[PDB]
Each structure stands twice: as structure tokens, then as C-alpha cells.
């Protein structure tokens, strides 16, 4: 559900 | 974890914080004497709810970005699984910003640093969430009384984030161990600096919880009043973290 949070983790 | 590993963890956490603290304490202190004039205050109070919400969402999003960086630099965080990283950040990023806020709070005159100058809570009138604003200021006032050092806020915010009691965690034992080692680090640091007495005085949990819950509720109210503004102007991350 949290792709924009996930992106910054990469 | 050995005493050497715990000592190194204190240093690691303090460095991660130093690198992501986003505003220097020295700069914030120096700018206390920069206070909004009456006309400037009036200007903010006359702003539309939309514009003031939009501004605050931008600034909050910026702060949250530094907290994500803090997390990524935090010993052991990138070892957790994707799901757990997300769960801890979704619950904890806002809590960390709220703690970080006490640096930008001046208890003498009860002002906060906002868009380059200090103002009181009257500055935020157009937001239309009086209870939330007062609660934020109360929270800052209560932290100011602890007089945290930079090192203390680094260790304490690490602990706000690494919280193994957040719902939806997969690798709870993994998060428990991280939390425990961070407690060891916090306690070691406080013992060394003769500050262990502050532990018993920390904001109860549920205090941070309530502030975050209120933020979510007020956003829902705003979004129902002005749904176009959120989809048009707010950062996508902010929507993802705080919308329904
Ligand atoms: C309105 C929703 N809200 C909260 O519920 C949680 O507290 C907040 C903080 C911030 N800040 C984010 C940053 F300070 F971290 F940068 S601020 O735009 O400089 C600011 C500073 C101070 C106040 C009183 C307000 C209202 C704003 C933004 C939004 C919220
Ligand atoms: Cl206002
Ligand atoms: Cl924005
Ligand atoms: Cl968390
Ligand atoms: Cl200050
Ligand atoms: Cl605060
Ligand atoms: Cl302080
Ligand atoms: Cl932090
Ligand atoms: Cl002590």
C-alpha cells in the first residue's frame, strides 16, 4: 500500500 | 551485545541524527529574537484554510523526509524487512518530527519557528484546529522542561521509531532486539552523563499517539472540505501516510 514510502527506502 | 558494541551504537545513533537534524540548534537559538510583527501575524490569520494547510503539509513532508534518512542511516534499520521498515516509519515518522519540534520551540515566550520567524499559536488560527495546535504547543512546552541535549534527542527519537509494539510487524523479535539495544545505548549514555533521572519523566506514550491521531482526524475534516486541494497540491507521500 505504500509505494512512495517504499521508493525513498531504496 | 557487548559494552563496546553498545558504546559504538550510541556514537552511531548520534551521528545519524547529526547528519539528518535539518536545522542547526545554534541557528534556531540565534533566531529567537526574530519574531513576527502584528501585521505579519494578521496576514497569516487571514490566510485561507487551504493555503495554510498546504503550506504546513509541505513543511511536515520535508521534515518526514529527514526522518526517513535518519531511519536509513540508523544501525540495524535497513536489516529489517521491507514491511517492518514501512510499519515503523508510517507509525513513527510523525512522532519523531513532533519530538524534533522542541528544538524550534521557545518556552520563555511560547513561540515556534515557522517560515523563518517565531510566532505564537495565534499564528495558526486559519488552520481551524485549535485543540490540535494547543496540544502541539503543550507537548513542546513539556519537552522544553526536560532540556534535552542533542545526543539525548538522537537516542530518544531512535527509540520512538524502533518500537516493537507497533501493530502489523512481521519480525517482532527482530524489532524487540533492536529496541532493547537502543534502550541499552540510551541508558548507558544517560548514566554516563548523570541524566538517568529524566527517563521517568519522558512523555507518556499515548501523548504522541493522541497528537498523531488528532492530525489524521483534522486532515480528514480538511480533505472533506477541500478534496481537490489535497490531490492537486499536497505531497503524495503526505497523502499516503495520513489520508483515508
Ligand atoms: C497542521 C498539522 N501538523 C501537525 O499535526 C503536527 O505538527 C505539525 C508540524 C508541522 N511542521 C512540520 C515541521 F515543523 F516539522 F517542519 S511546520 O509547518 O513548520 C509547523 C510548526 C508549528 C506548528 C504549530 C504548525 C502547525 C506547523 C506541520 C504540520 C503539523
Ligand atoms: Cl493562521
Ligand atoms: Cl507542497
Ligand atoms: Cl514506529
Ligand atoms: Cl528555540
Ligand atoms: Cl514538541
Ligand atoms: Cl529542549
Ligand atoms: Cl531523529
Ligand atoms: Cl545517572
Author numbering:
A (entry chain C): 4 to 13
B (entry chain A): 265 to 508
Question: What does the primary publication say about this deposited structure?
Answer:
Retinoid-related orphan receptor gamma (RORγ) is a transcription factor belonging to a sub-family of nuclear receptors that includes two closely related members RORα and RORβ. The nuclear hormone receptor RORγ regulates transcriptional genes involved in the production of the pro-inflammatory interleukin IL-17 which has been linked to autoimmune diseases such as rheumatoid arthritis, multiple sclerosis and inflammatory bowel disease. This transcriptional activity of RORγ is modulated through a protein-protein interaction involving the activation function 2 (AF2) helix on the ligand binding domain of RORγ and a conserved LXXLL helix motif on coactivator proteins. The conformation of the AF2 helix can be modulated through targeted ligands which bind the LBS and increase the binding of the coactivator protein (agonists) or disrupt binding (inverse agonists) thereby enhancing or inhibiting transcription.
Using a FRET based assay we discovered agonist BIO592 which increased the coactivator peptide TRAP220 recruitment to RORγ (EC50 0f 58nM and Emax of 130 %) and a potent inverse agonist BIO399 which inhibited coactivator recruitment (IC50: 4.7nM). RORγ518 bound to agonist BIO592 was crystallized with a truncated form of the coactivator peptide EBI96 to a resolution of 2.6 Å. The structure of the ternary complex had features similar to other ROR agonist coactivator structures in a transcriptionally active canonical three layer helix fold with the AF2 helix in the agonist conformation. The agonist conformation is stabilized by a hydrogen bond between His479 and Tyr502, in addition to π-π interactions between His479, Tyr502 and Phe506. The hydrogen bond between His479 and Tyr502 has been reported to be critical for RORγ agonist activity. Electron density for the coactivator peptide EBI96 was observed for residues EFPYLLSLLG which formed a α-helix stabilized through hydrophobic interactions with the coactivator binding pocket on RORγ. BIO592 bound in a collapsed conformational state in the LBS of RORγ with the xylene ring positioned at the bottom of the pocket making hydrophobic interactions with Val376, Phe378, Phe388 and Phe401, with the ethyl-benzoxazinone ring making several hydrophobic interactions with Trp317, Leu324, Met358, Leu391, Ile 400 and His479. The sulfonyl group faces the entrance of the pocket, while the CF3 makes a hydrophobic contact with Ala327.
